[model samples]
Target: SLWQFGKMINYVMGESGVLQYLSYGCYCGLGGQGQPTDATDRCCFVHDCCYGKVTGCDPKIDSYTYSKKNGDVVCGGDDPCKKQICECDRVATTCFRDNKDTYDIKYWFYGAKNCQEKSEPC
Candidate 1:
């Protein structure tokens, strides 16, 4: 049923469309090739394109880490705040650069821990 199939497609492409797709596992490969077997499969590709594409992580600093009933205090200091911290957990949210493009669209992960400066020099 084409109508039924269409419904399925819409469901997979819904809000968080790409993110949900990849999170669920569609297996379209890194390049977004390989047709999906069904709605589940299709989503896998969209998923990879979204969440899987995360390239970096940006952490918020000087924010309150722990909270008390009375008040909140500065959790940590911002060291090397200008430079971006790189790690595996830092997922790329966008794709700026590709084979065709001279540059890549790299982004950082949200809701990650900030890189704090060491009190003592190494």
Candidate 2:
């Protein structure tokens, strides 16, 4: 799960703002995949779009990486895409926290417990 993974990275890196955002796939995976489990996952789905080539400004240039030692989301260079991508991640994490209770802690590493049966997909 990208959100969960971000959670860990945020904690480790002391960048609460950076940790949150990801996948249009799975509860937390890479790229677009299966149906979204819930609104929280939907947030991740959107986050994926935030990093996508078509939807976002530029994944190749805007995409960031985490430092294994320091755990920082390093950007290639200062560009509008970088700022936009970070904003996407900020919004995503905010959404995740807003729907915090729905997060399946039991399956924290993998699945989603609160499957949104009805209501708007996003």
Each prediction's TM-score against the native? 0.22, 0.52
Model 2 — TM-score against the truth? 0.52
Residues 11-93, model 2: lDDT tens digits: 44347424233322253444435567677777777766766633436543445432234433332346565556555555565
In candidate 1, position 3 carries an lDDT of 24
Per-structure clash totals for the candidates: 16, 1
Worst 10 residues of 1 by lDDT: 88-97
Worst 10 residues of 2 by lDDT: 16-25
At residue 8, what lDDT does model 2 achieve? 39
lDDT tens digits, residues 1-122, model 1?
A: 11222223234333433333233222422333334334443333443444333434223221112211222111222433312221110112121011113221121111112212221111
**Best-performing candidate as measured by lDDT:** 2
lDDT of each: 0.27, 0.50
Cα lDDT for residue 6, model 1?
A: 23
Predict model 2's lDDT versus the native.
Answer: 0.50
